[PDB]
């Protein structure tokens with residue numbers, strides 16, 4: 764059972780701007796997604812401070828980076844708080860409408876796309892390098908869901924029947940044909956060292972056969 768939704772007009776405009784603007788510094792997508800994962804891990808850690816049972820779905824707080832050259836996917840996995848179905852539909856738990864408004868005013872006033880994260884809509888920087896993005900997520904208060912969009916004004920949400928995750932979020936980037944450098948081990952390490960050196964959770968870069 765697959766539900767198809769239209770993006771709010773402002774969010775469709777944001778993804779069009781990300782996809783169509785000439786902007787060479789695409790590597791910041793990874794910083795933005797890792798920062799999102801850190802934020803989600805902060806949230807479940809804070810909740811566990813007064814209620815330890817919130818970690819019954821998994822005690823480890825970490826971030827894994829999983830490149831797959833056969834599938835041409837880069838997957839960012841975290842064991843953070845996750846998102847409910849309502850969160851997914853409401854722009855993946857962001858205030859994307861007012862964030863897009865502020866971001867686009869900043870762009871016409873000196874800013875560049877690399878500062879997208881200061882406006883709370885850094886997730887959509889995934890479309891700098893991905894033709895399609897799948898988000899698998901599991902929140903303690905809801906079931907496991909899959910969100911997916913190839914932009915173009917719509918996204919889908921369905922119940923996920925894949926591997927159960929316990930708790931957290933998995934962002935699967937289906938990379939553009941000319942963006943496969945972000946599957947290379949040395950390129951990912953360089954980006955993590957450059958932009959994510961002070962993230963307070965272990966980041967594990969998986970290797971391939």
Ligand SMILES: Cn1c(=O)oc2cc(S(N)(=O)=O)ccc21
Nearest residue numbers: 826827829838840841926933935
């Ligand atoms: C293939 N794959 C995937 O799609 O998500 C994964 C998560 C893990 S984890 N973080 O549990 O080691 C390991 C492998 C995968």
